[PDB]
Scaffold this active site. Structure first.
Site, PDB file in Angstrom:
ATOM      1  N   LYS C  46       0.752  -1.414   0.399  1.00 39.23           N
ATOM      2  CA  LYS C  46       0.405   0.594  -0.004  1.00 39.23           C
ATOM      3  C   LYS C  46       0.791   1.048  -0.243  1.00 39.23           C
ATOM      4  CE  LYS C  46      -1.399   2.490   4.016  1.00 39.23           C
ATOM      5  NZ  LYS C  46      -2.062   3.869   3.377  1.00 39.23           N
ATOM      6  N   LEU C  74      -5.273   0.626   8.152  1.00 41.52           N
ATOM      7  CA  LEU C  74      -4.187   1.240   8.267  1.00 41.52           C
ATOM      8  C   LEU C  74      -3.984   2.978   7.778  1.00 41.52           C
ATOM      9  CD1 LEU C  74      -0.780  -1.040   6.480  1.00 41.52           C
ATOM     10  CD2 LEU C  74      -1.031  -0.311   8.763  1.00 41.52           C
ATOM     11  N   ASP C  75      -3.620   3.977   8.450  1.00 48.84           N
ATOM     12  CA  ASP C  75      -3.819   5.164   7.860  1.00 48.84           C
ATOM     13  C   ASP C  75      -2.513   5.566   6.586  1.00 48.84           C
ATOM     14  OD1 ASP C  75      -3.239   5.993  11.322  1.00 48.84           O
ATOM     15  OD2 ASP C  75      -4.501   4.837  10.598  1.00 48.84           O
ATOM     16  N   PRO C  76      -3.469   6.635   5.954  1.00 47.12           N
ATOM     17  CA  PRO C  76      -3.228   8.013   4.790  1.00 47.12           C
ATOM     18  C   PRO C  76      -1.509   7.540   4.652  1.00 47.12           C
ATOM     19  CG  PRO C  76      -5.593   8.846   5.681  1.00 47.12           C
ATOM     20  CD  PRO C  76      -5.093   7.678   7.249  1.00 47.12           C
ATOM     21  N   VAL C  78       0.726   6.551   6.380  1.00 44.86           N
ATOM     22  CA  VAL C  78       1.124   4.539   6.172  1.00 44.86           C
ATOM     23  C   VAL C  78       1.540   4.057   5.361  1.00 44.86           C
ATOM     24  CG1 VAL C  78       0.860   3.381   7.826  1.00 44.86           C
ATOM     25  CG2 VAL C  78       0.069   4.482   8.849  1.00 44.86           C
TER      26      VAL C  78
END
Ligand SMILES: [Zn+2]
Lengths: 74, 121, 327, 53
Positions: C46, C74-76, C78
């Site tokens: 990602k 999972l965060d932007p 990240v």
RNA sequence: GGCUGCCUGGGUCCGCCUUGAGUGCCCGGGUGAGAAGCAUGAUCCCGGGUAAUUAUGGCGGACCCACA
RNA sequence: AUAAUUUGACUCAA
């Protein structure tokens, strides 16, 4: 009253960091050795056995409480 | 050397390509920045494409070389990206630059165009 | 250095002579390229920018699938490893939502602290911890207790710390990083993050960016070569390695697929370490995932006796026309 | 972006040179992606020559 | 009793248990520079984007009742 | 439909 331990340092964000061994709760009274009010508990973190505790100071000078012993009022 | 570079650049010619942009800035007009560069290609507006040899990751400029042979445009690689920006007149780096108006650099540009023919096929 | 997912079990033999028939059922090798997508999980790299939820939807549209999932949020900002469930194999996420995780984290410090004291504090954050999920969370804001396995220190450059870290599922890196900064005094925030491991998913050759993903897809769609798109997605049995498995005979397959619970007289082989309440994967002898369910017995009780219910079959994935009826 | 990785050994760092083996280091964060992927057609043509299609 | 077909508890697969509009953010299109971050997109406008699973109650449907 | 979970969501209205 119950004891926590020695104060480590005052963070610039607004917290006095104490090194304790027991698990406290949200919004606890904090006093020194002579039963005078110091601050209120806002954040508890770190390891299981020996967690750190961050304190919100409701006093004028939290810069003199470096290298002190803080308690919890019972 | 990275995989999007399809041919070797003699060290003199790369300087010649830098000499183009440097002069182009003042006499003609130029397109600075990959996104802009690509726009300058598909609209057929471009006259020469200048990509850096040190682009990371590879995918950001990769599309240019095949898009250049698509719309007939000759294209060239240059060593540094940090050096490409300064020659284009900015603080930071540019990965790819394209020239619209040659300005005074007409002949210098037209010469680079002919030496890239032989290095292709 | 390791996780509960790393701990390799061992195959135990209740029956040695129960053999597999090659004509019924389809293994990961002999799955048609269409079938592999239905029962497939994408090991995705990602890139940062979008939320994990938006990632799903793009894959949904580009590859034209009607249902898709992921192994956690999972965060932007990240990046890194993300398991991507597809079609029928969408529900397999329930096994990857609680599984062990690992990230590589960069941590900026607002002050100056000599090098050796940091590792001393970095050692100290190994065990159980108390955290409260921040305002920006998908779960309820309550004081839970999460587990931390190991924090190995990579490198330092004065104010910035590079370090490898693996934790239990749901554990907040930002909450931890902030708390370690308060354990040193000057405080800390997180400027950048990347995942590296999620259960049995790590940075290997099966890991793939979104670019290459769609590229390989159109290479089979427009040009029509199957080899490349094949290794892009993985057989859903990959998301099972970290779970206890039970190998069942050819006769025990069809019955279970019709919703039936696995009995002891249907077991041939089984993993070691099973307790009552644990989720156990049900496998054919050719290593194809049949179903998931909770155990009714231990590794001893399924092994010794010949009568009783061993596994409560809960979630069926394998189709019914694969293995014919033998009950 | 600052988190880099070696394309040879598998080590994360902050420098430009591999402080270990001695290779050139590249950015770890994968290329940014669009749901439209504007020039995808052209990127595929470059990937064809390298892979040999 | 064995079997078919109507009947129905349990198990299992598929559907459904609101949709608008607004904040943050992201991405495209258009535009192309003095904090310095940033040409691997500053600013400004317009368009579009924001997943899943488990447990229990309700509802429409598809198989089957199986110690192998 | 209600309550949880995953490191990312919050405000409103028929
Ligand atoms: Zn190296």
């Amino acid at each position: 009253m119950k004891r926590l331990g020695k104060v480590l340092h005052y963070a610039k964000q607004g917290f006095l960091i104490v090194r304790t061994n027991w698990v406290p709760s949200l919004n606890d009274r904090v006093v020194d050795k002579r039963l005078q009010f110091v601050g209120i508990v806002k954040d508890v973190f770190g390891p299981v056995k020996m967690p750190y505790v961050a304190i919100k100071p409701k006093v004028s000078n939290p810069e003199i409480y470096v290298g002190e012993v803080l308690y919890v009022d019972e | 050397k990275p995989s999007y570079v399809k041919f070797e650049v003699p060290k003199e010619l790369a300087e010649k390509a830098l000499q183009a942009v440097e002069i182009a800035r003042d006499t003609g007009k130029i397109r600075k920045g990959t996104n802009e560069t690509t726009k300058a290609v598909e609209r057929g507006q471009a006259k020469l494409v200048i990509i850096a040899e040190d682009v990371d990751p590879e995918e950001i400029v990769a599309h240019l070389p095949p898009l250049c042979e698509e719309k007939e445009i000759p294209y060239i690689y240059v060593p540094s990206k940090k050096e490409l920006g300064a020659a284009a007149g900015i603080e930071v780096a540019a990965a790819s630059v394209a020239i619209i108006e040659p300005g005074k650099a007409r002949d210098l540009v037209e010469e680079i165009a002919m030496k890239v023919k032989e290095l292709m096929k | 250095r390791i996780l509960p997912a790393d701990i390799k079990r061992e195959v135990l033999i209740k029956d040695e002579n129960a053999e597999t028939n090659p004509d019924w059922g389809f293994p990961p090798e002999k799955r048609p390229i269409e079938m592999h997508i239905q029962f497939g999980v994408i090991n995705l790299d990602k890139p940062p920018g979008p939320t994990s939820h938006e990632v799903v939807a793009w894959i949904k549209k580009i590859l034209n699938l009607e249902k898709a999932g992921h192994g956690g949020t999972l965060d932007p900002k990240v990046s890194g490893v993300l398991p991507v469930a597809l079609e029928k194999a969408t529900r397999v996420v329930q096994a990857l939502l609680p599984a062990g995780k690992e990230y590589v984290a960069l941590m900026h410090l607002h002050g100056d602290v000599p090098e050796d004291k940091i590792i001393q504090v970095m050692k100290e954050f190994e065990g159980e911890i108390i955290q409260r999920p921040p305002l920006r969370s998908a779960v309820k804001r309550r004081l839970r207790t999460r587990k931390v396995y190991y924090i190995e220190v990579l490198e330092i450059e004065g104010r910035d710390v590079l370090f490898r870290v693996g934790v239990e599922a749901g554990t907040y890196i930002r909450s931890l990083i902030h708390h370690i900064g308060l354990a040193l005094g000057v405080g800390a925030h997180m400027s950048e993050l990347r995942r590296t491991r999620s259960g049995p998913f790590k940075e290997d050759e099966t890991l793939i960016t979104l670019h290459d993903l769609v590229d390989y897809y159109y290479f089979w769609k427009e040009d029509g070569i199957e080899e490349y798109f094949r290794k892009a997605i993985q057989p859903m049995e990959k998301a099972v390695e970290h779970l206890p498995k039970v190998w069942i005979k050819d006769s025990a397959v069809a019955a279970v697929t019709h919703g039936a619970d696995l009995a002891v007289p249907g077991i041939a082989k089984l993993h070691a370490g099973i307790k009552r309440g644990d989720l156990v994967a049900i496998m054919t002898l050719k290593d194809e995932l049949v179903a998931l369910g909770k155990a009714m017995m231990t590794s001893q009780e399924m092994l010794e006796k010949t009568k009783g219910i061993a596994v409560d079959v809960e979630k069926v994935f394998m189709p019914r026309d694969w293995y014919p009826k033998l009950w | 972006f600052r988190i880099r990785k070696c394309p040879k050994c598998g080590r994360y760092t902050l420098k430009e040179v591999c402080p270990v083996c001695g290779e050139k280091t590249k950015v770890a964060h994968p290329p940014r992606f669009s749901p439209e992927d504007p020039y995808g057609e052209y990127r595929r043509r470059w990937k064809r020559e390298v892979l040999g299609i």
